[PDB]
Amino acid sequence: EKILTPESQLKKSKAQQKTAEQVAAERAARKAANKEKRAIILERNA
């Protein structure tokens, strides 16, 4: 039979995936915020 993965390991993997699905979106949000902040800083310096 196929050795089933540990239940604790399955829960850990699910939690890691759920956290990564939000961290990835937060990375893009941070990149967009950084771009906007750079534009604002450029205009303020000018």
- Judged by the rule CB under 8 A, the positions of this chain that interact with another protein are 1, 3-9, 11, 15, 19, 38, 41-42, 45-46
**Would you say the C-alpha torsion 33, 38, 41, 46 has a positive or negative sign?**
negative
Separation CA 46–CA 35 (nearest Å): 17
Q: Rounded to the nearest whole angstrom, what is the least distance from the CB of residue 23 to another protein in the complex?
A: 9
Rounded to a whole number of angstroms, the minimum distance from the CB of residue 42 to another protein is 4
C-beta of 1 vs 28, nearer to another protein: 1
Instruction: Between 7 and 28, name the residue whose CB sits nearer to another protein.
Output: 7
Cβ-in-10-Å burial (0-12, 13-18, 19+) of 32 comes to: exposed
